[PDB]
Design a protein around this ligand. Structure first.
Ligand code: BEF
Ligand SMILES: [Mg+2]
Ligand SMILES: [Mg+2]
Length: 123
């Protein structure tokens, strides 16, 4: 149960990561940007779940998700997008690209835990 968490915000990565921990998810890998995310995925096809931000340099999350979905190794990888892009137009955009679950920032650590528990349960 290997998770890859991607976000250009350092404090966001903290919180997500801490929150995964509380849910019993400890095998967490981080990336700052899309390029690094992609690199890590490419080199570790055993990754189970992708959790990605949208807005970031060096390849945004949208481009990342499309790339991932296009790879024949990651056609069924669950993909959760966690983003400030709260408008439905962007939601639709993301679902069409292959995002499976959409969580909108900002959130308290408690709300994040609920919203993630909904998708991931405990581990
Ligand atoms: F920079 Be993200 F889309 F919250
Ligand atoms: Mg960002
Ligand atoms: Mg935020």
């Amino acid at each position: 149960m290997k998770l890859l968490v991607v976000d250009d915000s350092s404090t966001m990565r903290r919180i997500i990561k801490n929150t995964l921990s509380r849910l019993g998810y400890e095998d967490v890998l981080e990336a700052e940007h899309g390029v690094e995310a992609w690199e890590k995925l490419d080199a570790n096809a055993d990754t189970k779940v992708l959790i990605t931000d949208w807005n970031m340099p060096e390849m945004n999350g949208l481009d990342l998700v499309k790339k991932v979905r296009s790879d024949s190794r990651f056609k069924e990888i669950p993909i959760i997008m966690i983003t400030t892009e709260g408008g439905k137009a962007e939601v639709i955009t993301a679902l069409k690209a292959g995002v499976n679950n959409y969580i909108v920032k900002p959130f308290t650590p408690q709300v994040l835990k609920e919203k993630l528990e909904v998708v991931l349960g405990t581990n």
